[PDB]
Amino acid sequence: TLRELRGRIRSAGSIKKITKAQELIATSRIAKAQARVEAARPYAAEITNMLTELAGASALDHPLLVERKQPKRAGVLVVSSDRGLCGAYNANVLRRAEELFSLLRDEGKDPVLYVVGRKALGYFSFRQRTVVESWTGFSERPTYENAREIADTLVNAFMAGLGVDELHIVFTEFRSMLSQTAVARRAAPMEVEYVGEYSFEPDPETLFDALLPRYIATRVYAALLEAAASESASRRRAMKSATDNADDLIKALTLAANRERQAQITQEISEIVGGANAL
């Protein structure tokens, strides 16, 4: 009846306002996130340079650089959002997560799972696989303080070889505002990459053994920043889609309500005139 349609029109209008507001908010936050990404980059680049000029002198025998004789168990970090309305973000991340799990179990390993984000936590708590540990409440604005703990936990889980023979990270790479996707990277064991063409205190081996964990930490930090930017961009896209859907719903509901208005008036007039023509 008409009252229901009028109420639903009011509701859809309110929803449309909210969704347009969150769309513009996301459009601003993607710029905040890109700003943080480009502010963080110049540290990672200098760490890369320092680590390579140390590697040139080092023995290149640190555990993280050498493969195990027979791997059995691989750690995997899945990064997901803390807030909904992102659309496909969590879906893409988790479908890639399961594709990587099927790759591992095809090779012969088994995954032990670490999760960032409440969404993936709910997903892996519904599908019965046990999460070793998880972190929540910063996927929107990650600070190095969190990446430090994540890297520490993963590196300790690796160096124990319960323990793992490999470390992977599943996240999303922000290629451009219009285009993004989920990606899988092996974080350990690291391959050594020889390419053709200093005083170290107290020794190069010591600095290298102390530095590699911090390289892991800064890399996971950069991955989380890329993830947050991708999340904000996908939020933008999905909220624009929702605004458009609400606009089309308002259109259809208004049309139906106007048809009901006309039908109601016509029926009332026909009733009045039938009463008149009866007398």
Binding site: L178, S179, S234, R237
Partner: protein
Amino acid sequence: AINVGVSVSRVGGAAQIKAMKEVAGSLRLDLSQYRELEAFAAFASDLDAASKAQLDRGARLVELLKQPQYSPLAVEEQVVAIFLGTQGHLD
């Protein structure tokens, strides 16, 4: 502006000449699935190459179907015009 999804001929291909019946008879469902594929991919950040190729084929078929006012094409020409598209020579 024929809506290829809602439009129907409840006599069907009984009154269609064999040439057009062979060349074009696949076009209807291909265009409908192209329309839904476009409605989906409108917000796909990335998608497989096969979907993209079907999408381009559909877009070029849609561009093929339209024609200007007062310009009726004989069937002998319509069959060729649809052959160009369905057999992929426009790719």
